[PDB]
Design a binder for this molecule. Sequence first.
Ligand code: HEC
Ligand code: HEC
Ligand code: HEC
Lengths: 138, 261
Amino acid sequence: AEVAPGDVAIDGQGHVARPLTDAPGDPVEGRRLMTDRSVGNCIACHEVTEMADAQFPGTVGPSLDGVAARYPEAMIRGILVNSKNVFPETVMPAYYRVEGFNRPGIAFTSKPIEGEIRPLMTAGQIEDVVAYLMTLTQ
Amino acid sequence: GPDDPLVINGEIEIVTRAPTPAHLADRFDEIRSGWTFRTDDTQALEMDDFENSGMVFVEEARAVWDRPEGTEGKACADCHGAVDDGMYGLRAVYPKYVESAGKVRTVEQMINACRTSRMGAPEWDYIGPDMTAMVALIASVSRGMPVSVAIDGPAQSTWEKGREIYYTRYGQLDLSCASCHEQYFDHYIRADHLSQGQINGFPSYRLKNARLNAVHDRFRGCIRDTRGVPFAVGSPEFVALELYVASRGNGLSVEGPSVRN
Ligand code: HEC
Ligand code: HEC
Ligand code: HEC
């Protein structure tokens, strides 16, 4: 049972204390999803050293080493729901938004989205990635 | 290296670092050629025309420049003379306001206007190989010369439209040209070392697709990769944006055809 994009409860620091799904998040799958450019495409901006097989991580975002020792779960999930709530004017994409874009296209096809905008990541995929991020206590 | 000199064929000094144009001094200290973000091996490929695969197309365009084409039975050279003279300095100052059009026009638009209305020849696809080879020939004969696009006068409202597009986030990734190229140049997105997104080196010959790449083709690709819908090639929006990005490299040498990743 998911919490849809528009229904997420987000406090004044951008945090989301409630999981987007009841499906507990799979750290393993999470790991995977962050390297897939089709989904999260995280290591384009982020290093994760624990992802030793990573291969050419970007340096646009800070290294994600130890992010579970500095931010609580609810802030980490907030960052994935809508990074802008936590980091105003951030270049980090908003991964569970579906409104307010400017010329959004279907993937990298260049064609306009007609109809429902889907989130960059599903509830499951976000929960999977957060589950993972929470293992980075270093 | 980022601070090594770029000299082409041993004769052509390329200014690859320059003081920020006044309209942009606000945002960084220096403007830099995209050449200065490439690896040594890659930088090497532009230091000499026998190694720059982009120059193969330029030589083919040198032939086309002299080929009568269209119903008028004329070739470019028939009106413009030898290309190294008739196009001397010209890439430095486009996109510019063209009185006969009442608009800022691109080099590509001017070429096609000559093709259909003076040569009686079919238009070339705006980002196709014919047009990009020719634009690269035109560029190549001005290499060394400081890019100097007017940003005021009758160009001004185009320049500002281009400027607003440059700072608008697009796509479901919600990113602007400046998101990547102004805030984060010198960082890495994955394998790519982020430049300031200058176009002083276009058409670029890229190792990725082993062909010349036209300005509007990169623009399209760039918006596409915000997961967004790019404007049309030749559109007034990209004409606007091109004028604008061009002015972001005022003072840098004309460099095209350049070699990039
Ligand atoms: C560049 C377009 C990014 C992509 C793709 C992803 N992130 Fe990011 N992230 C980015 C920046 C620039 C920042 C720092 C905030 C700022 O703009 O000042 C971040 C930050 C995070 C954080 C917080 C870490 C910390 O501050 O120490 C987390 C947990 C994070 N990012 C996670 C994350 C994930 C899981 C991504 C893939 C879906 C991801 N980011 C992509 C820039 C970018
Ligand atoms: C005479 C019949 C021409 C032939 C053949 C070609 N061009 Fe031309 N060109 C011509 C004129 C009279 C003008 C000036 C137009 C104006 O509105 O003022 C031009 C201009 C250009 C430009 C603009 C550059 C400038 O000096 O501002 C370009 C880039 C250009 N022409 C390119 C071009 C090419 C590539 C041609 C061969 C395919 C070509 N021209 C042929 C007249 C004639
Ligand atoms: C990050 C997701 C980007 C956004 C948003 C834009 N660009 Fe980009 N661009 C990006 C990379 C990773 C690269 C390759 C590395 C490099 O900087 O050289 C580029 C490259 C360009 C270039 C080529 C530069 C060259 O010297 O040949 C140009 C001209 C360019 N980018 C233009 C551009 C414009 C106009 C954008 C806004 C629509 C834009 N880019 C956004 C990454 C990103």
